[PDB]
Write a protein that binds this DNA or RNA. Structure first.
Ligand SMILES: Nc1ncnc2c1ncn2[C@@H]1O[C@H](COP(=O)(O)OP(=O)(O)O)[C@@H](O)[C@H]1O
Ligand SMILES: Nc1ncnc2c1ncn2[C@@H]1O[C@H](COP(=O)(O)OP(=O)(O)O)[C@@H](O)[C@H]1O
Ligand SMILES: [Zn+2]
Ligand SMILES: [Zn+2]
Ligand SMILES: [Zn+2]
Ligand SMILES: [Zn+2]
Ligand SMILES: [Zn+2]
Lengths: 827, 791
DNA sequence: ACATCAGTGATCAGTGGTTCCGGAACCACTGATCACT
DNA sequence: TAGTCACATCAGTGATCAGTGGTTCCGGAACCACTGATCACT
């Protein structure tokens, strides 16, 4: 029938026509190593194929995307369904759109602020309402019964001019009544008029007081005035009342919002955009934002009536500041009106379903106004997880990245249950996740890339994960199932009371002003369920202050009082998964610092001696070293008439960003193109006489960059490998023990073996007399560190405090943190 | 394991809170009536919600309100309908179906550089210029410019301007200033009429000049037209500006779009066919059928056949799917410029069955449109195999063959109009047989049926139309007879070119000679018999009105009659205001709260609006001021309210309104609300409206009606009502000729002209004609064979 | 007792964006009037 | 085979306007100045 999915012919990088058939509508995992090929095998190729198939079948634009995107690197793919990529691929990074808009609830914010918010004009606080003639005619009831008035049709309001001809025309129609400059005369015998003299021409139409059931004559003259007077009349207390119709404000005033319309409060749209920031929120905030990312008129004046929950009186910015939980609980129960209930029931249902899935993932501490940059990858990953589990399309295919980033252990287990829900839905699941518990908890597991780099990409194991245990060759299989594992260091480097960096007064956001101490020169790790605070505790305060002081920057100090520890460190250098550089001038080889070295060595070639090639001339940055047509990229770009772009290798450059003149020099029997393209593995093997570069390259190989090549582009390598090369380079940069620095979650996409390799690397960094604090939720980071601090019992409400600051074994003994609980479980 | 798809609470128009389950990994058919909601459910709600689901699951890009409580057992929905098609011909059929790409891979595996290797699928893809001819870059037609179209009237001064961008608005004044700059730069006078201008001066005008001239540099209307589509937003503007680009295929490869030298050298080794030197220019020109035939047999050497065999099998399978579709006679070089709705439906069906996605939903429409019955039989086999791929197939098709061949059937809209939109059957269709309330089942069981008329309107050879010398394309100068004064009908196999004959030759000539049309007559030496006719009328499924502004009253013209009727009230007299006052599209009487539209409408792009009665209206779509008149005890709102049949039983002693309502009652679809928006009326309903309107024009029958295949939009009973309409017309003297794949319709038509010995270019001549029985006795038509096995 | 690789740093020597410019006028489609007869 | 006879209007019929739908369209190089190396020195 339809119960299995087959892929055949995965031939790319280390993948060698790798193939596999699996049971559709089950839970399946993809394991292996870093760079083992699973990344592209699952995301780049299989997801590309499925999405391309569905978009071509349906009418997505031209049914296409990237012109078939990648060519099919599978001899045959069968039994498929439209793939769904649950990945950290991308999000909404627009500064105009904050997480409030990204959460598909800015529309609902505007919906509520339209009518629930104060529907009143800013100028006079009068309920914004539009012009109507029916109210004009019905206003006769408002004016007391029997009170004299006049049927005054303002035909020509205040427009002065000698208009005896107009008098004659009005007679030609036939009314016999008129009033000019507020004085009545008969059209039969009107007064004289001059252009200089002001003439307020409101023609009397009929003789009437407030009578009973006089609507016949009333309407007769009244719609007449609504045309002649053009919509306006007055019933004065001639014995006051004005029978006028005005749009927007009833009094003809301007409005912050022209009416009760949600888009009026959309600064991403020009409705709410400031004159001086255009929705960006900057000029230093623009003078008309002052913290609120909205126009001051459209901040609260026309929308202060949001009676959400209790005491509800909110500005658009106020709801923005309402955290996830704050706004969700506010909207859980609120009384704004029956029509509002009818037209916002869908609003409540969408929001509550979204929040239920958000809790199913365990994500509330983020705020509606919280900067989208706070997305930790795992955050947006969980956003999409909730979206797709709520979608409920049964049988759809779903390929998962690793969402554990920014998550706790048993929280991740509960999320694993969340996905097993989708498995039970009949949906097909292919997984990728370093969490062990995720492993051993799937209907099927396929381990790949027996070797990590280009050398290994085959499916070393393919079974119920039992064949992973039976598959000893799978190094990751051995690491996970227990054939081998990382080890706890015998010695936890003792505290250093003298040189200790201690933050005091840290109350930024969730933080409760607690003070946190950290020894310097000995390894340390920080723990806490995501949302606890450590992230901004360091970034916004510790790292921010230390960096802008030691290096004289202007970073945000954060909410803190003081930070001791500066005197013990020569400087701070924040280092994280970031790349080396987006520009073409930034490439592995060039930006690793070996650029000038290779340039000089190539100048030292025998040919370069008989050629006089300057080292800077061996740079593509200068024109001499590069092909000017390529501008330093060694390729030809080809765009044509409304057709996709193509690229070709440049011939003079030979694809090396170095014209043939530069490439002719063949340092050590190798041109610049060669000494770029060869792998980092053979680079460490090579340059043996060159002490510095050889040490750098072998350090890179130890970090595990052998299969990568020095000549690769910067974009071609992941941020994890970028930090790998950065740590390898800084390894030989005279640490002196005082370069105590900071680090983020490094466990991203690392197999246990390379995890332990980097563990040894950081052990060396610590033995250098230094400490690079690490923000890692993982267990082994703590189990190997020698000082540990947990941000309160749990995240958010738990966070902003400390439960065990001291030794890793101290926190292990401490059960106040689940981190210490799992430590007690294992060491 | 949940293997069934359930819908819960579909509410729209006559359809209301529809709940039902279907078996997944099965095949589903739909039945009912026009406007009955069967189509609205199958596509307008089911696939509507499915596409909503996949846009909320659009994992790429930035990711309406289906009026349904819930859905369960869902799968991604695929739309397959005569409507779901586009007008982009550049992507020829081969490229669109991707057949081309796998042939390119085959030829890549067929490395044969010939005496004067180098074979990858990219090098064969004329779509992009690795292989595409150097001159045209694989473009079907050279984008030249027509001097006559650019300048229709040379007598006018160049300053006055002939091209559209030179005429309207401040934009036109800018364009005229740039043209004056071009004149003062190049050296052509700006005010000299093209007639008085030198020919080289006109060519320089149309090619512009270099340099920037006020400043703005222009190089004639060659590339600004190409930029206009990019600049403009709506597709209408770009289509307007693309219409008049001369199409002159490049002679260097003469339509065989690829480098003529490369196709002969790099890949002449292809022995695809009679062991001939199959160049890929030839491959491109090869029709679907012929190209498949020579792709079946070909020797390229042991290595090449070994490394290309799998792609050949893939080609055979997908082209077998296309053959079951029946568009094998269509040629690969064919584009979609003249593509038909049924042809596009077939194209999508073949492409998305070749894609071979298992466990994916498909909503489908009438496959029989522009398809022979045996062809649709093999197509039903194709769809049954598609179902064997574990694919759900929601379908709507009146044709019985598709019916009674699905794992499940659902009949909807027991009534057709607003009254009926609910579910009258859902099951294995055996309980459809049990379900006697199903009108489709009643027709199936013979409760209602149609056949030949008791007598065929006698054909007079004297008063006959004739089409001699019609050779346009598939045609070969055939002289064809058409009885006049009676109902003849054009018939034959699908794609047989009889349509093109009609539209380009028959209809074209008749319209330009009688109705004053100025369209191209194709290629015909002459036509005769116009002396027996006065003015033709070509009618099809097109909707009568695309806006709610127009309504049954406005179209029928009875609207002003009823307005005057209301003016006849004594209250109307005393108020002293015109029938236009009583109108609903009139400024004065239209309440500003709705512009007299009844409910109040305001909405943004994201989600649809909701109807809300207005204080003035309460659904009255009027103003009480006007409604105060109650002519014959009825307000204007009430009069516009009661639908056609109730109005018909009303207005009895009146005359013109009586004729209108009698026409509509005879039509029998009077259920339609008098104020029912034209947009809320199906194409078949609009067709019935059009035939009713023409039924009230006293043409004496001298006129002749030509018609498309109208099965769509008309149920069996709707077709019977239309048959009665045409019967009355022809008894009034009218002539008729209809393209139609329905045996009953043609057997009812008193004469048949069946053209086409073979589909496509194999047709182009009368294979038989005469009474339906006469044409049947001649098996030269397959439709004739069918009219023979019947009767 | 150097080391040719070290070691970064503000300016200076290449990059880095951003765009105005708000609309009615004008013209094509069909309705209705508007005769008109 | 002949001059007077005198008791308006449905329904075309479309022109023709005269409203509605939509048009549409340009100039881009400048302007604001901002931003990653390279010797320099240590
Ligand atoms: N931009 C911000 N706006 C508001 N609150 C923030 C912001 N950044 C951080 N926070 C606060 O810091 C906490 C972040 O916790 P986090 O450090 O991610 O947990 P962990 O310490 O487990 O990594 C949240 O509780 C939040 O209230
Ligand atoms: N101008 C034209 N462009 C393309 N094809 C044409 C043209 N004129 C005639 N034909 C031919 O006429 C055929 C059209 O078939 P058609 O008449 O729609 O089928 P049927 O005979 O069933 O109505 C095409 O197959 C084509 O060979
Ligand atoms: Zn006001
Ligand atoms: Zn602002
Ligand atoms: Zn180059
Ligand atoms: Zn060509
Ligand atoms: Zn209204």
């Amino acid at each position: 029938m339809a119960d299995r999915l087959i892929v055949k012919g995965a031939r790319e990088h280390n993948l060698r026509s790798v193939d596999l058939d699996l049971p559709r509508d089950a839970l399946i995992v993809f394991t292996g190593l870093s760079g083992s090929g699973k990344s592209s095998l699952a995301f780049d190729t299989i997801f590309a194929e499925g999405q391309r198939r569905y978009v071509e079948s349906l009418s997505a634009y031209a049914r296409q995307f990237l012109g078939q995107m990648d060519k099919p690197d599978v001899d045959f793919i069968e039994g498929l369904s439209p793939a769904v990529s649950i990945d950290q691929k991308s999000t909404n990074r627009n500064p105009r759109s904050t997480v409030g808009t990204i959460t598909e609830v800015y529309d609902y914010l505007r919906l509520l602020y339209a009518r629930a918010g104060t529907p009143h004009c800013p100028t006079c606080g009068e309920r914004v309402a539009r012009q109507t003639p029916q109210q004009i005619v019905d206003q006769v009831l408002a004016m007391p019964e029997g009170t004299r008035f006049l049927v005054l049709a303002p035909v020509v309001r205040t427009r002065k001019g000698e208009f005896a001809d107009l008098f004659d025309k009005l007679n030609a129609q036939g009314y016999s009544r008129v009033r000019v400059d507020g004085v009545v005369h008969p059209l039969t015998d009107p007064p004289k008029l001059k252009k200089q003299e002001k003439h307020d021409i409101e023609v009397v139409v009929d003789r009437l007081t407030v009578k009973a059931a006089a609507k016949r004559r009333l309407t007769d003259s009244v719609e007449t005035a609504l045309n002649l007077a053009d919509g306006i009349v007055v019933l004065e207390f001639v014995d006051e009342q004005r029978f006028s119709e005005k749009l927007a404000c009833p009094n003809g005033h301007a409005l912050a919002v022209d009416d009760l319309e949600p888009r009026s409060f959309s600064f991403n749209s020009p409705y709410g955009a400031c004159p001086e920031c255009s929705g960006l929120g900057i000029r230093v905030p623009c003078p008309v934002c002052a913290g609120t990312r909205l126009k001051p008129e459209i901040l609260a004046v026309t929308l202060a009536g949001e009676s959400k929950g209790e005491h509800g009186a909110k500005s658009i910015a106020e709801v923005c500041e309402l955290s996830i939980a704050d706004c969700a609980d506010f909207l859980n129960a609120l009384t704004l009106g029956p029509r509002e209930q009818a037209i916002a029931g869908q609003v409540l249902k969408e929001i509550r379903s979204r929040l239920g899935f958000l809790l199913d993932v365990g994500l509330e501490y983020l705020s509606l106004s919280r900067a989208a940059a706070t997305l930790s990858g795992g955050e947006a990953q969980r956003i999409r997880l909730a979206t797709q589990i709520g979608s409920g399309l049964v049988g759809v295919l779903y390929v998962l990245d690793e969402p554990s980033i920014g998550l706790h252990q048993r929280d991740n287990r509960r999320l694993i249950e969340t996905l097993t829900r989708l498995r039970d839905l009949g949906n097909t699941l292919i997984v990728v996740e370093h969490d062990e518990d995720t492993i051993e908890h799937a209907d099927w597991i396929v381990d790949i890339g027996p070797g990590a780099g280009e050398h290994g990409g085959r499916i070393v194991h393919s079974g119920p994960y039992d064949e992973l245990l039976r598959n000893k060759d799978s190094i990751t299989g051995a690491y996970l199932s227990g054939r081998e594992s990382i080890e706890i260091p015998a010695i936890r480097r003792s505290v250093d009371p003298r040189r200790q960096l201690t933050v005091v007064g840290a109350r930024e956001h969730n933080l409760r002003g607690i003070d946190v101490s950290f020894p310097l020169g000995v390894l340390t790790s920080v723990t806490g369920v995501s949302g606890s605070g450590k992230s901004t505790l360091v970034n916004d305060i510790l790292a921010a202050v230390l960096a802008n002081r030691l290096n004289g920057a202007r970073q945000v100090p954060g909410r803190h009082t003081r930070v001791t520890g500066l005197d013990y460190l020569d400087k701070l250098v924040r280092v994280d998964q970031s790349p080396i550089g987006r520009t073409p001038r930034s490439n592995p080889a060039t930006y690793t610092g070996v650029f000038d070295k290779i340039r000089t060595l190539f100048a030292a070639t025998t040919e370069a001696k008989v050629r006089g090639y300057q080292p800077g001339r061996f740079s593509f940055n200068v024109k001499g070293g590069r092909c000017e047509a390529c501008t330093g990229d060694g390729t030809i770009k080809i765009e044509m008439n409304f057709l996709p772009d193509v690229y070709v290798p440049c011939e003079v450059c030979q694809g090396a960003r170095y014209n043939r003149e530069t490439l002719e020099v063949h340092y050590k029997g190798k041109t610049v193109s060669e000494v770029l393209d060869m792998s980092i593995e053979e680079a460490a093997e090579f340059f043996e006489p060159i002490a510095g570069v050889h040490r750098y390259l072998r350090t890179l190989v130890d970090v595990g960059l052998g299969y990568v090549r020095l000549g690769q582009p910067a974009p071609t390598l992941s941020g994890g490998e970028a930090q790998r090369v950065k740590l390898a380079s800084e390894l030989q940069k005279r640490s002196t023990g005082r370069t105590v620095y900071i680090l983020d979650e490094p466990t991203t996409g690392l197999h246990f073996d390379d995890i332990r390799k980097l563990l040894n690397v950081i052990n060396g960094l610590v033995d250098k007399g230094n400490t690079v604090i690490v923000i890692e939720h993982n267990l082994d980071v703590i189990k190997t560190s020698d000082w540990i601090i947990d941000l309160g019992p749990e995240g958010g409400a738990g966070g902003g405090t400390v439960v065990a600051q001291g030794t890793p074994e101290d926190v292990a003994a401490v059960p106040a943190s689940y981190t210490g609980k799992f430590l007690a479980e294992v060491v």
